[PDB]
Write a protein that binds this DNA or RNA. Structure first.
Ligand SMILES: Nc1nc2c(ncn2[C@@H]2O[C@H](COP(=O)(O)OP(=O)(O)OP(=O)(O)O)C[C@H]2O)c(=O)[nH]1
Ligand SMILES: Nc1ccn([C@@H]2O[C@H](COP(=O)(O)OP(=O)(O)OP(=O)(O)O)C[C@H]2O)c(=O)n1
Ligand SMILES: [Mn+2]
Ligand SMILES: [Mn+2]
Length: 1264
RNA sequence: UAGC
């Protein structure tokens, strides 16, 4: 550690709260990090005096593996294939030797890549060589699934931990987290690597580079080492940052060692990934004595996902685990994978927890962070053959006699059918009828929005489309000479802009390009990038599904972020006396096929949409005539609407299937088109469509099937009390059945058990394998709940992992900084120990803040000041002589965050500056007699501040674009969007109108006329950048670093004029004995105190924020939040109604609607969150789990604590000020470590009137 | 070639 201490000494102290932070120390540490060689990190690791408790037997078979050759073969189709040994799954990268297939590197002599000799032979066609290349390429691919070299994460850990225990400001004592000599993962990482390198000077087992991956030329290396080491690094860091229990951590190291020990690391990891969850989470409290769980009320209407805390629910034996015991299967699983030692130890400990509290949920949490975090990987060929193969087993087919004759491509489900499809057809027909009945549906704007949905900078199988068209002799414009990426649906849009639907129809049957996705703890999944025509024709399906989800069921449309997965619902569902069944349908996409679902859905839509769409086109598609054979004998032609014409063509595609074109870059010679009946995932229908069928079938069960298949009085009662509108929440193939409890306690376990079994049997009837889980736990959208307590699953957020499906290289340097920051926020949302996490993050950041730059022998260095990270969100540990750890990780981001920490130590800063020579005669309103201008330039605070706001990736704009083709393109884009003359006309009105009532007031008028321009830029920025464009980006960051400044942003200089008074601590909003999120307990002071004082966010953030906008959606390309800002800004700038009416017309609204909304906007009382956008203030993501709405409303007093002040009074017409002011008060409160306090407006320098004009100036100047 |  002397090697680490000597080199990072001062820095270590600055991030441990012993000494102040400063850019000089920081940048020097950065330079030290940059000059540490890989092998030096292993040397540093050797200096560590590991304890015996940190050691465990390392399996010798981890080093001696067979040849890859016996693990592959060539099939009847000549494609290289993985040869199965452990079962159908055994398709991943096998654990084998690899050195025998390498050629030493020219320079890094001890490292090697795949023999170029082997590849050429493979490219020739040699079977043995192909096998070898494939294994070589996939093994490498498995190794690329990480953010950067493992040594950087390790080094930062060394630096951070060299600081020793941290003193808690609140608890007023040092934490007791074991030091590194007790870190078992680290010991393994060192020993495993040392054993491989052996007598070699190079200590790294492999090198993660740009030129690819290189293996250390040791006969001891294995294709399983990269995954293994990556797993150990994650555990190593968490044992120190999440305060994980070391005894548990060793259990996780064992599974991993067993994984590398097996014949296929990934396969093994996959087959055992439920060990920790099963022997802890899903087995808690078989016995229960005490503890408290939340008591929540689900407000009406349940669709709002809005809840209210009502105190605590005392627990007792009355609530012990009633769900079936998983013991048997659990022990079996352990026995089958040689892990019965671990499974047993876990069962033993789980039984010792007889009280529900912080301690026990922390144990579950700790247990679950130990699961491997690797992104499983296998060759494309295999994913495609394993995912587009299985077909649903419809145990009860829809009788052939139940269909009418054809009506084009569809057949009507006779209403005489006794098939369960009867009800599936009803829901969709009904929905379709109501959707097409809506006036909005026929509005030129809505149809424009729809048509813009799939016009994105993403792929759409462009090549296959261009050739399907060529087959009918139709050539698309090539826009030869444009600097935009051609494989964008945006490019596609332009090529089709001026072509009749009848000419592009054939494209609906074009092939589909390959697209893949690797996931943590899951198998890779293939994706279907549908083309514009295919997406167009899919509309009716998508809209009818949306109509169902919005009006007929209880469903969520969530993303991937924890902030949007409705946490409140899980707390409710899992709190006794409530119970929940976690439903999931396995092989969902393979389950939605023509034979049952699609052939019925198409018919339903096509018929329920008939009368309202009659005699009308839709989204570009024309009406037409189709052959009719419904009735027997009677065979005529039928006039169908454009909307119907879509279903007509879509039905044709759903019937034929999809031609998945597989170009496997990992398996030489594996080129082939595979036809599959699996449902498309890249379809705009996918998600919404699966959510609708889900709830529809559940409705049919509870309402029809169920009741008809059982006379059990209780099961019938339980069922009757369940409605899909109140008790069943779902998204996609995920379902959460919430059985509310009574005063008599919870519903009988045996009656629930009976119910479930009927659901299972019910699904076999239409080819759906329900994966039902009834274990006392609530699990929805990978969010884990128990007794009202949310259990973060850390294993799913690998600190070093990163998905990399394609062979393409990682993004140039700067890019990694955004990834590092994301790692930090995860740690916040996941509840890691705040001080330990913040310190490590500073280590990690410093370690990635410097990059070597080239300009042609002009070897300089790019360096981000420590201040840039603050701008990005990382809280300061100690600065300007302040006390240590006064800043919380809930500190806002950007300007709002800068204002907050600076406001919290204004005096401190001023005093410090003066005491160091930065004195002046001019008294600053904010910093008194401090020479802040000279100070902030010298500390690189201004520099860091501005550098933070610069693009972290190369810009492609500015590439030479021959004006003429440049105009042809944006024209086609325009035509696509401006298909319907009525819409264009709407915008032209908005324009001439704008020139009379709005032009001049603001300068950001959003307009549909901009979209074509934004679309072009998007297609541009999607293209690969040049080394030149890369040099330009550096120069930019480096120019801002040289430049010196005299102020911050106009907005921030305004916030600084506002002073506050921090007061008495708030009272608890929830019981302090109440577990809400494992990890957030009295051992994690700041996160905890904030949780208790501020309160948890009990409403769905998606539903909440949807209430802060006048318009939900707009044409893709424009920003709903932008539009909201312009309208409110015009109003604040005193613009006339007519002016707002003009803006709305420029974005697509019909005058009637425009004038109505404009008039409505004018008189509304806009809420804090919505109003604060006029000045670009946004609720920090980190705050999303807290009740920020209460804070704004009841704990940020704008009335000075001691009465009215002249400066504090708010001018009549400047009420909007109060909203901006609220964000500033909360910003300081949330940034201050400890309990939320009540902050009181103390002062506004030039007064509120001056402040308002100041903000108005910024407003009217945006975009000039 | 890399989707919603
Ligand atoms: N349409 C669509 N749905 C997605 C996507 N990613 C996830 N989902 C949906 O949300 C669900 C949760 O998926 P996961 O893949 O577990 O993502 P995650 O939510 O980020 O998991 P984590 O807990 O580790 O943060 C599965 C699926 O129905 C995506 O890219 N597109
Ligand atoms: N990047 C992703 C990931 C998932 N999905 C969609 O999510 C849906 C179901 O989610 P999973 O449960 O994750 O997929 P399954 O195929 O059902 O997994 P398996 O039975 O193990 O659960 C189907 C799939 O198309 C998607 O469109 N895009
Ligand atoms: Mn599933
Ligand atoms: Mn699912």
């Amino acid at each position: 550690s002397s090697m680490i201490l000597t080199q990072f000494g001062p820095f270590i102290e600055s991030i441990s709260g012993i000494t102040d932070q400063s850019n000089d120390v920081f940048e020097d540490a950065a330079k030290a990090f940059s000059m540490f060689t890989r092998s030096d990190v292993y040397k540093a690791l050797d200096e560590i005096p590991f304890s015996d408790d940190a050691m465990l037997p390392i399996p010798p078979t981890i080093y001696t593996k067979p040849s890859h050759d016996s693990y592959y073969y060539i099939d009847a189709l000549n494609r290289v294939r993985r040869k199965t040994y452990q079962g159908p799954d055994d398709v991943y990268v096998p654990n084998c030797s690899i050195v025998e297939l390498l050629e030493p590197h020219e320079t890094l002599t001890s490292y090697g890549r795949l023999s170029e000799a082997i590849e050429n032979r493979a490219k020739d066609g040699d079977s043995q060589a192909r096998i070898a290349t494939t294994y070589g390429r996939i093994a490498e691919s498995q190794a690329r699934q990480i953010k950067a070299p493992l040594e950087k994460f390790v080094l930062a850990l060394l630096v951070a931990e060299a600081g020793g225990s941290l003193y808690d400001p609140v608890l007023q004592k040092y934490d007791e987290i074991p030091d590194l000599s007790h870190n078992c993962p680290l010991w393994c990482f060192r020993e495993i690597c040392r054993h491989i390198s052996g007598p070699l000077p190079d200590r790294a087992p492999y090198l993660y580079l740009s030129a690819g991956v290189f293996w250390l030329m040791s006969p001891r290396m294995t294709s399983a080492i990269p995954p293994l080491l990556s797993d150990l690094v994650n555990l190593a860091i968490l044992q120190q940052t999440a305060g994980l229990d070391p005894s548990l951590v060793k259990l996780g190291v064992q599974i991993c060692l067993h994984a590398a020990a097996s014949s296929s690391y990934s396969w093994f990891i996959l087959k055992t990934k439920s060990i920790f969850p099963q022997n802890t989470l899903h087995s808690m409290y078989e016995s229960l004595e005490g503890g408290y769980c939340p008591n929540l009320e689900w407000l009406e209407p349940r669709s709002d996902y809005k809840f209210m805390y009502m105190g605590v629910m005392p627990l007792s034996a009355k609530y012990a685990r009633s769900a079936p015991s998983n013991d048997k299967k659990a022990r079996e699983l352990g026995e089958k994978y040689g892990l019965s030692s671990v499974v047993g130890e876990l069962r033993k400990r789980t039984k010792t927890y007889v009280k529900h509290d912080f301690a026990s949920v922390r144990y579950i949490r700790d247990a679950m962070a130990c699961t491997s975090g690797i992104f499983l990987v296998r060759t494309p060929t295999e994913t495609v053959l394993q995912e587009y193969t299985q077909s649903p087993e419809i145990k009860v087919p829809i009788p052939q006699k139940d269909w009418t004759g054809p009506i084009g491509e569809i057949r009507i489900l006779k209403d005489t059918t006794s098939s369960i499809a009867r009800y599936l057809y009803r829901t969709w027909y009904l929905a379709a009828a109501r959707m097409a009945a809506q006036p909005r549906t026929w509005d030129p704007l809505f149809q424009a929005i729809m048509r813009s949905q799939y016009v994105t900078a993403r792929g759409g199988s462009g090549a296959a489309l261009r050739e399907s068209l060529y087959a009918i002799n139709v050539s698309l414009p090539d826009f030869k000479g444009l600097p935009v990426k051609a494989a964008t649906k945006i490019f596609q849009a332009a090529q089709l802009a001026n072509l009749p639907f009848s000419h592009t129809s054939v494209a609906i049957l074009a092939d589909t390009s390959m697209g893949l996705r690797n996931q943590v703890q899951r198998r890779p999944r293939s994706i279907m990038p549908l083309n514009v025509p295919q997406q167009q024709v899919s509309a009716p399906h998508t809209l009818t599904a949306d109509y169902i989800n919005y009006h007929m069921n209880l469903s969520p449309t969530s993303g991937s972020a924890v902030i949007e997965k409705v946490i409140p619902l899980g707390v409710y569902a899992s709190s006794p006396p409530n119970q929940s069944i976690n439903i999931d349908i396995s092989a969902c996409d393979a389950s939605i096929t023509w034979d049952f679902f699609l052939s019925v859905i198409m018919a339903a839509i096509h018929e329920g949409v008939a009368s309202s769409s009659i005699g009308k086109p839709f989204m570009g598609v024309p009406a037409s005539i189709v052959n009719d054979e419904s009735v027997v004998g009677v065979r005529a032609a039928r006039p169908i609407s454009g909307m119907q014409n879509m279903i007509q063509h879509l039905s044709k595609l759903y019937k034929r299937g999809f031609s998945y074109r597989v170009n496997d870059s990992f398996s030489p010679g594996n080129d082939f088109t595979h036809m599959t009946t699996t449902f498309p995932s890249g379809s705009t229908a996918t998600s919404t469509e699966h959510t609708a069928n889900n709830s529809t079938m559940m409705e049919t069960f509870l309402t029809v099937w169920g009741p008809e298949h059982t006379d059990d009085p209780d099961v019938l009662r339980l069922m009757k009390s369940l409605t899909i509108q109140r008790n069943y929440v779902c998204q996609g193939d995920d379902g959460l059945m919430i059985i509310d409890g009574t005063t008599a306690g919870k519903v009988n376990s045996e009656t629930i058990q009976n119910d479930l079994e009927l659901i299972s049997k019910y699904g076999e009837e239409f080819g759906w394998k329900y994966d039902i889980a009834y274990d006392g736990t609530a699990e929805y959208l990978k969010l884990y709940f128990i007794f009202g307590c949310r259990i973060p699953n850390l294993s799913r957020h690998p600190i070093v992992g990163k998905e990399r499906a394609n062979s393409s290289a990682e993004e140039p340097w700067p890019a990694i900084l955004d990834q590092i920051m994301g790692v930090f926020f995860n740690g916040v949302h996941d509840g890691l120990q705040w001080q330990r996490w913040i310190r490590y993050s500073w280590a990690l950041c410093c370690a990635f803040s410097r990059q070597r730059t080239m300009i042609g022998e002009s070897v300089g260095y790019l360096q981000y000041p420590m201040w840039s990270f603050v701008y990005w969100g990382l809280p300061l540990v100690k600065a300007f002589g302040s006390d240590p750890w006064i800043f919380s990780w809930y500190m806002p981001t950007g300007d709002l965050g800068m204002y907050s920490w600076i406001s919290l130590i204004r005096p401190l800063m001023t005093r410090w500056m003066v005491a160091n020579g930065y004195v002046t005669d001019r008294c600053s309103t904010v910093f008194g007699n401090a020479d802040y201008r000279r100070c902030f330039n010298e500390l690189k605070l201004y520099q860091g501040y501005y550098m933070a706001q610069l693009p972290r990736n190369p810009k492609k704009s500015g590439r030479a674009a021959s004006r003429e083709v440049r105009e042809q393109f944006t024209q086609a884009l325009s035509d696509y969007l401006m298909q319907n003359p009525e819409l264009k006309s709407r915008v032209l009105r908005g324009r001439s109108e704008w020139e009379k009532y709005g032009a001049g007031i603001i300068h950001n008028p959003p307009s549909l006329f901009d979209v074509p321009h934004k679309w072009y830029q998007g297609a541009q920025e999607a293209a690969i950048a040049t080394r030149e464009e890369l040099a330009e980006m550096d120069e930019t960051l480096m120019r801002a670093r040289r430049h010196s400044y005299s102020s911050f942003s106009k907005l921030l200089e305004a916030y600084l004029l506002v002073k506050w008074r921090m007061c008495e601590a708030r009272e608890p909003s929830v019981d302090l004995r109440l577990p809400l999120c494992a990890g957030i307990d009295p051992l994690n002071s700041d996160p905890f105190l904030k949780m208790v004082s501020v309160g948890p966010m009990l409403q769905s953030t998606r539903k909440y924020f949807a209430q802060t906008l006048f318009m939900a959606k707009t044409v893709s390309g424009l920003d709903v939040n932008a539009i909201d800002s312009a309208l409110l800004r015009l109003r604040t700038l005193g613009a006339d109604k007519k002016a707002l009416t003009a803006q709305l017309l420029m974005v697509g609204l019909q005058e009637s609607e425009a004038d109505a909304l404009a008039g409505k906007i004018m008189l509304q009382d806009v809420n804090t969150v919505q109003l604060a956008r006029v000045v670009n203030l946004a609720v920090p993501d980190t705050w999303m789990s807290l009740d920020f709405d209460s804070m704004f409303k009841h704990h940020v007093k704008l009335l000075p604590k001691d009465g009215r002040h002249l400066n504090t009074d708010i001018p009549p017409r400047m009420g909007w000020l109060r909203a901006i002011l609220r964000f500033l008060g909360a910003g300081m409160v949330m940034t201050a470590t400890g309990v939320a306090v009540d902050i009181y407006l103390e002062d506004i320098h030039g007064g509120g009137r001056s402040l308002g004009q100041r903000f108005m100036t910024w407003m009217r100047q945006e975009g000039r």
